[PDB]
Amino acid sequence: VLSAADKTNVKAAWSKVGGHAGEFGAEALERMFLGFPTTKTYFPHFDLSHGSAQVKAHGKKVGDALTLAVGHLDDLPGALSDLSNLHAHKLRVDPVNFKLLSHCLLSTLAVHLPNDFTPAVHASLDKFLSSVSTVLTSKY
Amino acid sequence: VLSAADKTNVKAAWSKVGGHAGEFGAEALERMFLGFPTTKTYFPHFDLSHGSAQVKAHGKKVGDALTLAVGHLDDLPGALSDLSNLHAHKLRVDPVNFKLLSHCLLSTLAVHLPNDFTPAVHASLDKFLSSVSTVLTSKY
Amino acid sequence: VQLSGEEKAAVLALWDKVNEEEVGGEALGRLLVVYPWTQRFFDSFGDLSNPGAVMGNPKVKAHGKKVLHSFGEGVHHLDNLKGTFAALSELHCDKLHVDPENFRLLGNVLVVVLARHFGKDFTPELQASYQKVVAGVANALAHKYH
Amino acid sequence: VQLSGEEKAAVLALWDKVNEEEVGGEALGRLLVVYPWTQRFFDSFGDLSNPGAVMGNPKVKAHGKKVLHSFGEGVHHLDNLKGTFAALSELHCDKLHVDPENFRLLGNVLVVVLARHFGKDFTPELQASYQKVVAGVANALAHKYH
Ligand code: HEM
Ligand code: HEM
Ligand code: HEM
Ligand code: HEM
C-alpha cells in the first residue's frame, strides 16, 4: 500500500514531470522494446522503429493514464477499472511485463530528472508503479 | 482480488481441511525447509529436524492464522495487521519466501485432499495465498 | 544438477510410475486455469474460457503429453540438461517468445500434480529432489535467451 | 553473454567514465531504501532505519564500491562470467544465503543509477546492452545454487 508520505512524494514528483508524461511514456516503451525484446510480441500492429508515430501516440496514452492514477491514489481500482479489463481479458499481458515497463519508466525518469529522482522519491514511485501494476493484473 | 466465486471456493475448501490446518501447516514448513534451504535462515532458534516440536507448534500458528484469514476475506488488511508489522518490520522476510511457502502449502493440500483439490479450487487457493502474502508484505 | 546417487534413484523410481498422458494433460490444464495469461500461447487449441473446457480439450492433453515426455528425457539425462534442451530453448525464445518465468510456473504446477497423484509417497524429501529437477529443466530451457 | 563487437565497445567506453565509489555507494544505498528487506543482510553496518542514514553510512559506501569493483571485473571478462564469479557465487549461497532474485534487483538498481549519472548519453540502445550485462552477472552469481 501507499502511505500518506508515499502519496505526497508521488504527487510532488509527478508535478515535476508535468507536461512531459507522454514523451517519458514513449521513451520508456522504446527502452522496454530494446531491453526486453519479448515485449514486442504484444505490438504486432505497430511500427516499432525509433520515433514511430504509433509508439509516440501510445506513450501519450500510457503517460495520461499514469497522470489519471496520480489524481486517484485513494481509489486506483475504480479509476483504472476499464484498463484492468483490457490488460487481463483482451490482451492477456503476462504480469512479468509490468515489472519491465516499471523499470524502464524509472530509468527514463532518472535520465530526465536526476536532481529530483532522490532515493525517497525512487522508493515512492516504485510503490506507485507496483500498485498500478497490481490493479492492471487484478482481474485474473 | 478475490471474486465472490473465489471466496466461496476458499471457504468450501478450508471446511474440508477443518481440524488438519495445523498439521498441514507443519508439513508445508518441512517441505519448504527441505525444498528451499535458504528459508532455514529465518529460524536459527528452531530445531528443524523431522517432527521437531517447534516446527509442529509453528505450523499450528500458521494454520490458525490462515483459518483466521478465511473468516475475514472481506478485510484481510484489518485481521492480519499485527502479522504485517511482524513480517516487514521485525523479521524482514524477503517477499520471495511467501511464494515458496504458498507452493509448499498447495503441495501439502494436494497430498492430503486429492479429490477436493480440483483445478478451480487450486486457482482460488492460489489467489487466496497471494492475497495473504500481499497483506503480509504490505508494510514495506 | 546437484543430486546424490540415492536422490537420483528415488527420482527415477517415481518416474517409472508417471503416466505422461494423465500427468501431462493435468499439468498443462492446471497452468492454463491457474495462470490464465498462459492461454495467450494456445489460441489455436480453441475454447479455453472455463476450467471444464480446458481440462477436456484434446489438444491440451496431447500437448501436455509432449511436454511431459520431454521432461522425462530430462529426468533420464540430468548430467546434460543444457544439451538435451538446446533445440527447445531456441524454439521457446526465437519462435514462441515465452517469458522464462513461465517455465518455473509450469515446473511448480507439475510438482503439485505429482503430489496429487502420489499422495504420501511424494514425501518432503522426494519433493525437494523434484524441485532441483524442475529448476534444472527451467534453467536449461532459459539458456538461449541470455 | 551475447553482445556484438560494437555493443561491447559501447559498454566498455561507458565503464571508463564510472566512478565506482559514487555509483557503488548510490546503487547499494538505493537497494537498501527501495527494497528494505535487503537491510537484513547488513545489520553489522549500524543504523539503516531512514534514507538519510543509509546514504551517508560509510560502510554502505565502502561495500558498494567493492560490489561495483567486482561488477567491473565482469564488464572486463564478459566471455567468462561463470569463471569470474565462481568464488563469489559460493560465498553468496553457502555463507550469506542471499536469494538470487536480489542480484537481479541490484542489477536493475545499478542501471537506474547509471541512467541518473549519464542522462541522455545513457541511450535506449546502451541501456539494452547493460541489461544483458546485469542479467549475465546475476546468472553467474546464481550458478552454484542450482
Ligand atoms: C503502467 C503500466 C501500463 C499502463 C498505465 C498502460 C496503459 C494503457 C492504455 C492507457 C492503453 C490504451 C487503452 C485505449 O486506448 O483504450 C493501453 C493499451 C495497451 N497496452 Fe497497456 N499499459 C501498461 C502496461 C502494459 C504492458 C506492460 C504491456 C505489454 C508489454 C501493455 C500492452 C498494451 C497493448 C498491446 C495495448 C493495446 C495497444 C493498441 O492496440 O493500440 N501495456 N495500455
Ligand atoms: C502464509 C504465510 C505466512 C503466515 C500465515 C505466517 C504466520 C505467522 C504467525 C501466525 C506467526 C507467529 C506470530 C506470533 O506467535 O506472534 C509467524 C511468525 C514467524 N514467521 Fe511467519 N507466516 C507466513 C510466512 C512466513 C514466511 C514465508 C517466513 C520465512 C520464510 C516466515 C517466518 C516467520 C518467523 C521467523 C516467525 C517467528 C517464529 C518464532 O520466532 O517463533 N513466515 N508467522
Ligand atoms: C518444463 C517446461 C516445458 C517443456 C519441457 C516444453 C516442451 C515443449 C515441447 C516438446 C514442445 C513441442 C515442440 C515440437 O513439436 O517440436 C513445445 C511446444 C510448445 N510449447 Fe513448450 N515446454 C515447456 C514450457 C512451456 C510453457 C510454460 C509454455 C507457455 C506458457 C509453452 C508453450 C509452448 C507452445 C505454444 C508450443 C507450440 C505448440 C504447438 O505448436 O502446437 N511451453 N514445448
Ligand atoms: C551484482 C551483484 C553483486 C556483486 C557483484 C556482489 C559482490 C560482492 C563482493 C565482492 C563481496 C565482498 C566479498 C569479500 O570481501 O570477499 C560481497 C559481500 C557481500 N555481499 Fe554481495 N554482491 C552482489 C549482490 C549482493 C546482494 C543483492 C546482497 C544482499 C541483498 C549482497 C550481500 C553481501 C553481503 C552481506 C556481503 C558480506 C559483507 C561483509 O562481509 O561485510 N550482495 N558481495
Residue numbers in the entry:
A (entry chain A), B (entry chain A): 1 to 140
C (entry chain B), D (entry chain B): 1 to 146
Give the published text.
Hemoglobin (Hb) is an iron-containing heme protein that is essential for oxygen transport. The protein is an assembly of four globular subunits, each containing a heme B (protoporphyrin IX group; Hsia, 1998). Equine hemoglobin was among the first protein structure to be solved at high resolution. It is a useful model system for oxygen-sensitive metalloproteins due to its ubiquity and its high but reversible affinity for oxygen.
We have developed a fixed-target method that ‘sandwiches’ oxygen-sensitive crystals in between silicon nitride (SiN) chips, protecting them from ambient oxygen. Using crystals of DeoxyHb, we demonstrate the practicality of this design for anaerobic SSX, and further verify using UV–Vis and X-ray spectroscopy that the hemoglobin crystals remain in the deoxy state. The most noticeable movement is at the β-heme, where a water molecule is bound in MetHb compared with the empty β-heme in DeoxyHb. To establish the consistency of the method, crystallographic data were collected from a total of five chips, and all four chips that gave sufficiently complete data exhibited the presence of the deoxy state. All five chips with DeoxyHb that were also independently processed exhibited the presence of the deoxy state, with the exception of chip 3 that contained a bubble following the preparation, resulting in too few indexed images for a separate analysis. The doses of the first XANES scan and of the crystallographic measurements were similar (70 and 40 kGy, respectively), and both showed the presence of the deoxy form. As demonstrated by a combination of XANES, UV–Vis absorption spectroscopy and X-ray crystallography experiments, the described method slows down reoxidation of the hemoglobin to a level that allows data collection within a reasonable time frame for oxygen-sensitive samples. The XANES data showed that the hemoglobin crystals stayed in the deoxy form for at least 40 min. The β-heme of MetHb moves downwards to the proximal side of the heme pocket. Both structures are in agreement with published structures.
